[PDB]
Amino acid sequence: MGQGTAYAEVMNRKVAALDSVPPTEYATLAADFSRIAAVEGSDWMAAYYTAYCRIIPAFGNPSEADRLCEEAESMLSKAESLGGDLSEIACLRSMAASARLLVNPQERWQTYGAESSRQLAVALEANPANPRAYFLQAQSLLYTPAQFGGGKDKALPFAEKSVSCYAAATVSPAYAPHWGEQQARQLLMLCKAETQELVPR
């Protein structure tokens, strides 16, 4: 159709659809991102979305979540090899550990949760202002038993960080990840819990 297809143009259309389309069809789009990555003129961004697309439905697919994470994780590693943002891929990386965990979350959570936390620590280290890194930590603290020092209260400042960051940030160039923005805002409300606040009169 178009005379030429730019890398940014191709991803921009795919990302826009990716946001709107159900996570079920993510597998379909993931293949396209992989196809884009196969192209020599591709960035770590292609690898990022390839892993992302596979990882998101993984949470809803305990049947082979661990196995499907292998390709996504490898793709994340490829992005790392290219020289892409460590924090962003680390965020996906931790989710991959979490997704495979859901198969035995009451059993192996001790190990995978720790692995995810380590990966998240990497995300915070790589980008200390990363909204997604704080978001993932916020829920991690939420799901962390009190004996490990977790709790909703711990998650509160992290929820604030992610939300504050989105407000002060922009999504550029265009096909940059739009996900996590809505969730972080909701997460803070969830983190507070109750939220009766009778308001002034």
Side-chain angles (χ1 to χ4, degrees), residues 22-119:
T24 301
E25 301 178 73
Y26 268 32
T28 299
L29 297 177
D32 287 339
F33 288 108
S34 180
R35 292 170 62 194
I36 296 172
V39 177
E40 292 177 288
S42 62
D43 299 297
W44 72 285
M45 300 293 283
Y48 177 89
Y49 280 99
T50 301
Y52 167 76
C53 291
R54 183 70 71 189
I55 292 170
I56 289 299
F59 287 94
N61 189 33
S63 299
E64 77 192 304
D66 183 71
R67 289 173 56 250
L68 56 80
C69 289
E70 180 180 63
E71 62 173 75
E73 181 172 0
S74 181
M75 292 300 293
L76 292 172
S77 298
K78 293 180 183 298
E80 184 177 296
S81 298
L82 292 173
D85 183 83
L86 180 61
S87 184
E88 290 289 83
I89 60 174
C91 291
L92 294 176
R93 189 174 299 178
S94 60
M95 291 200 302
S98 299
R100 69 190 71 183
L101 177 57
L102 297 177
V103 179
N104 300 83
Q106 294 178 31
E107 181 188 315
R108 304 175 190 175
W109 69 276
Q110 291 179 32
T111 308
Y112 291 84
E115 293 178 297
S116 181
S117 297
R118 291 173 179 171
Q119 292 168 331

Side-chain angles (χ1 to χ4, degrees), residues 85-88 122-131 133-134:
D85 183 83
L86 180 61
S87 184
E88 290 289 83
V122 171
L124 290 172
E125 181 180 71
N127 187 334
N130 189 330
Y134 285 98

Side-chain angles (χ1 to χ4, degrees), residues 12-30:
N12 188 32
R13 182 178 180 180
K14 292 291 182 179
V15 172
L18 182 62
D19 182 81
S20 298
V21 67
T24 301
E25 301 178 73
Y26 268 32
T28 299
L29 297 177

